[PDB]
From a paper:
Although diffraction data were collected for 368 fragments soaked into the C2 crystals at UCSF, data pathologies meant that only 234 datasets could be analyzed. Of these, 221 were identified using P43 crystals (hit rate of 8.8%) and 13 using C2 crystals (hit rate of 5.6%). The unusually high hit rate for the adenosine site in the P43 form with the Enamine Essential library (21%) was in contrast to the relatively low hit rate with this library with the C2 form (1.3%). We identified seven fragments from the C2 crystal form and six from the P43 crystal form; none of the C2-derived fragments were found again when the UCSF libraries were rescreened under the P43 crystal condition. The inconsistency of fragment binding to different crystal systems of the same protein is apparent when comparing fragments that resulted in high-quality datasets in both the P43 and C2 crystal systems. Unexpectedly, only 5 of 59 possible fragments were observed in both systems, with 3 fragments binding with equivalent poses in the adenine subsite. This observation points to the value of having multiple measurements, and even multiple crystal systems when they are available, in fragment-based drug discovery approaches.
Author numbering: 3 to 170
């Protein structure tokens, strides 16, 4: 469990790797994988869609049941559901969608949810269709998360920009 390999330590507790988060979950067998969720837990693309596809749609079926029973999450909020074949747990975290006018200050609230878990495999929050600057998202992660977070970034050019941002 939690067999993280080949990460670069950026801070006392934040690590980064140029990797596919689904292939990392399969290799590492983490206690927790973080999903970059939306408030209705509709896993239609990006990391959410990739995680769901790797679970053979189990995540989406579980999420649909959760939302019909319990209602939507809030921006900045989270829920813990099954990790299925990826992890023990999946922490579904909703970062703000600034492309849709939501407040970037809620990215702090989103990352605060990571402090309820000793170690996490995670993507950067509010990246991709959520529209936040990835360098800013890494900064908020570093400033907010105090537990051990292993970040997976798929795209090499973005990984390099983030690592350079950070150590040069
Ligand atoms: N001190 C240190 C630095 C980097 C690391 O990256 C890993 O993949 C596993 C543990 C680790 C420990």
């Amino acid at each position: 469990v939690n067999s993280f390999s080949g990460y670069l330590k950026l801070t006392d507790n934040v690590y980064i790797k140029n990797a596919d988060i689904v292939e990392e979950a399969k290799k590492v067998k983490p206690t927790v994988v973080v999903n970059a969720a939306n408030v209705y837990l509709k896993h239609g693309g990006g990391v959410a869609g990739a995680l769901n596809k790797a679970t053979n749609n189990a995540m989406q079926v579980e999420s649909d049941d959760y939302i019909a029973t319990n209602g939507p999450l809030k921006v900045g909020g989270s829920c813990v559901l099954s990790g299925h074949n990826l992890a023990k747990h999946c922490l579904h975290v909703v970062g703000p969608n600034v492309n849709k006018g939501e407040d970037i200050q809620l990215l702090k609230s989103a990352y605060e949810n990571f402090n309820q878990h000793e170690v996490l495999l995670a993507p950067l929050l509010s990246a991709g269709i959520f529209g936040a600057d990835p360098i800013h998202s890494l900064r908020v992660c570093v400033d907010t998360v105090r537990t051990n977070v292993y970040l997976a970034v798929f795209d090499k050019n973005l990984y390099d920009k983030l690592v350079s941002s950070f150590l040069e």
